[PDB]
Write a protein that binds this ligand. Sequence first.
Ligand code: PER
Ligand code: CU
Length: 142
Amino acid sequence: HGWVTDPPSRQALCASGETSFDCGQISYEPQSVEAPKGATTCSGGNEAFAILDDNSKPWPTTEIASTVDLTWKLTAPHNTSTWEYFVDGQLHQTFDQKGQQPPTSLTHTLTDLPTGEHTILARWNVSNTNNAFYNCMDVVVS
Ligand SMILES: [O-][O-]
Ligand SMILES: [Cu+2]
């Protein structure tokens, strides 16, 4: 269990009261967006958190540079295979944790992000279950 706090993920914005709409249950447990491996959606297909896939909502965006430090908060630091970062659904960078336990505060540096409005999907793959955690971040790169 864990989520991306900076730049804030969709679930982080719900939990921080930064959205102008009610997100429902996700606002109380941003760490819990768990679903089977292999998805490329913001909820991972976890039906309890389908609001995270709704692009019609006025999701806030964060202004960032083309190289950015991204920070996770993990409440339960499961042994991890990879952290995968997608930009608009296409794989951009992978970090290999080698099946080890990560720190509960973890920062990764993404580079060469395209300019303009994009959605980054961070997929955290757990090495000893069939689940991943899914975090979308809406950003404007300049
Ligand atoms: O706890 O996954
Ligand atoms: Cu967990």
